[model samples]
Target: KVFGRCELAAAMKRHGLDNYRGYSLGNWVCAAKFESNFNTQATNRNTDGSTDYGILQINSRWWCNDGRTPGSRNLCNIPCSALLSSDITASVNCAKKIVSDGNGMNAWVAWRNRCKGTDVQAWIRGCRL
Candidate 1:
């Protein structure tokens, strides 16, 4: 499922991502924009053999167990496949876990490069929150 910007924003907000660990709703929305363009099935494989899955791109190395990533921690205690579902509940929960781990939004390079320190309000502009 591909979400419109406001739809994604509202979804994330519903999951308590707004002001989550000091990151605003725009920050989360912007990160999702760059990470997966709001596509629920997005995936990216890293050079280290770890895979990123879903909208927030939760990594296999540290979050989900894909049964392939070497030394996976599976901290999210979920199958990587769960992140790819259109439901997005597991994806949002795993993302909250990542942020709560003290890494902040810097866990995603896309967020670092594209959303961090930028005025991200435009990502959620005109959205009815």
Candidate 2:
């Protein structure tokens, strides 16, 4: 239930997401905007029958257990729904794991499509770190 850019930025800053796991705040913030519009509960169904979870849109096939299917690599060791909660600790941890695992922000389609190679400072403009 993060309401706007300010809250989102501040929360991310509080979690140290600005430079966590070698990723920039711009990259994270931009991806979040495109992925789930910063809505914690955001979910999207993939054609492969796997779903994306939370603001980071982690794929259930790799990062979360959706319960209806066999979870292949739940490295985060958390239920996908945990990513959908207002508290973002789980989501931040999972995101760090993802980048640390070498996928980086490139793992996110939104990062590739909208955030990558673009000016991302606007994502954090006027938002106090």
- lDDT of every predicted structure (CA atoms): 0.93, 0.84
TM-score of each: 0.97, 0.93
lDDT of 2 by residue, 1-129 (tens): 754877887888788898887667888888888899989999998887888989888888888888864646687899999999998888988888888877677888989988889988888888767
> Model 2, 43: alpha-carbon shift in Å?
0.7
Assess candidate 2 and give its TM-score to the true structure. Answer: 0.93
CA shift at 66, candidate 2, in angstroms?
Answer: 1.6
On lDDT, the candidate that comes out on top is 1
lDDT of 1 at 73: 91
Candidate 2 deviant stretches above 4 angstroms: none
Best by TM-score: 1
Q: How do the residues 13-39 of candidate 1 rate in per-residue lDDT, one tens digit apiece? A: 998889989998999999998999999
